[PDB]
């Protein structure tokens, strides 16, 4: 029971680290989102400028 | 100018793919944080049984 | 001149996304590995519990 | 202990739902990888044109 209690708190700490890891993925995807918004505006002005 | 537009059409196609892939990646990131919070809140009520 | 300016922010954005993507791919590998340890410790705590 | 073994086997299945969700995240990140090489090729085709 004591050896199994720390083994349950071994999966719980690893799962807490996946929340952290996934929130690094989330922070990176949010930086790609802002970059895509700036790029989406730039591609618009080119596609307007080439039709002009 | 036709050539530039064809490259702009490739940029367009690629930036739509990234905007949708990132919106779907983010949708599985919130599902993975919710399944993590669920599996943790479950596991701590197995620790409640082991104590 | 307007096209040249747009193509500059397209180049800069692409490099920023290339770097961000590289990092996010790394974090995804780190996440699956902690699911290897978390599942190992849970398929063994279910075995201790059932014993 | 019977219902502690059950709650832990429910937390196994909720952890196997993360092992499916994080496989979808990796495929979505491979879909931006394939589009980032298209963006650099397309901006090389726009740069020679605008020049």
Name the residue among C14, C39, C49 with its Cβ closest to that of D15. Answer: C39
Q: Are C6 and A42 in contact (CB under 8 A)?
A: yes
What does each C-alpha distance from B18 to A31, B23, B37, D35 come to in angstroms?
12, 8, 28, 7
| Partner-chain contact C3 B43, CB within 8 Å | no
DSSP, res A1:
-
Taking the C-alpha atoms of residue D37 and residue D51, their distance in angstroms, rounded to an integer, is 21
Residues written for chain B: 51
| Partner-chain contact C17 D47, CB within 8 Å | no
Name the residue among A8, A25, A46 with its Cβ closest to that of D25. Answer: A25
Q: Are B43 and A11 in contact (CB under 8 A)?
A: yes
Taking the C-alpha atoms of residue C29 and residue A20, their distance in angstroms, rounded to an integer, is 13
* H helices present in chain C, as ranges: 2-50
Q: Which of B41, B43, B45, B50 to mutate to test the interface with A (most CBs of A within 10 A)?
A: B50
Taking the C-alpha atoms of residue A9 and residue A4, their distance in angstroms, rounded to an integer, is 9
What was the elucidation method?
cryo-EM
Maximum distance among all alpha carbons in chain B?
A: 73
Shortest Cα–Cα distance, A8 to chain D (Å): 9
Q: Exposure string (b/e) for A11-23, b if CB count within 10 Å is 16 or more?
A: bbebbebbeebbe
Chain C CB contacts of B32 below 8 Å:
31
Q: Are A22 and B47 in contact (CB under 8 A)?
A: no
**How many CB atoms sit inside 10 A of residue A50's CB?**
20
- Residues 6 or more apart from D15 whose CB is under 8 A from it? A11, A15, B35, B39, C35, C38, C39, C42
The rounded radius of gyration (Å) of the Cα atoms in chain A is: 23
C32 burial class (0-12, 13-18, 19+ CB within 10 angstroms)? middle
Shortest Cα–Cα distance, B50 to chain C (Å): 9
Resolution in A: 12.7
DSSP, res C1:
-
Chain A CB contacts of B6 below 8 Å:
none
Taking the C-alpha atoms of residue D50 and residue D6, their distance in angstroms, rounded to an integer, is 66
Taking the C-alpha atoms of residue A47 and residue D37, their distance in angstroms, rounded to an integer, is 20
What does each C-alpha distance from C41 to A39, A45, B39, B42, C37 come to in angstroms?
45, 54, 13, 15, 6
Dihedral through CA B23, CA B29, CA B30, CA B31, nearest 10? 110
Taking the C-alpha atoms of residue A14 and residue C35, their distance in angstroms, rounded to an integer, is 7
């Amino acid at each position: 029971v004591e050896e199994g209690t720390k083994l349950a708190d071994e999966a719980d700490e690893k799962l807490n680290s996946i929340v952290g890891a996934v929130e690094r993925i989330n922070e990176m995807l949010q930086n790609i989102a802002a970059a895509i918004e700036e790029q989406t505006a730039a591609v618009d002005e080119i596609t307007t400028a080439m039709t002009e | 100018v036709q050539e530039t537009t064809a490259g702009s059409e490739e940029i367009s196609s690629a930036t739509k793919n990234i905007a949708d892939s990132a919106q779907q990646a983010a949708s599985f990131a919130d599902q993975s944080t919710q399944l993590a919070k669920e599996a943790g809140d479950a596991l701590k009520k197995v620790i409640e049984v082991t104590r | 001149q307007e096209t040249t300016a747009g193509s500059e922010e397209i180049s800069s954005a692409t490099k920023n996304i290339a770097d961000s993507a590289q990092q996010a791919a790394s974090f995804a590998d780190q996440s699956t590995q902690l699911a290897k340890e978390a599942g190992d410790a849970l398929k063994k705590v279910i075995e201790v519990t059932r014993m | 202990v019977e219902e502690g073994t059950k709650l832990a086997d429910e937390a196994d299945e909720k952890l196997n739902s993360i092992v499916g969700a994080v496989e979808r995240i990796n495929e979505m990140l491979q879909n931006i990888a394939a589009a980032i090489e298209e963006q650099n090729a397309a901006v090389d085709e726009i740069t020679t044109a605008m020049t």
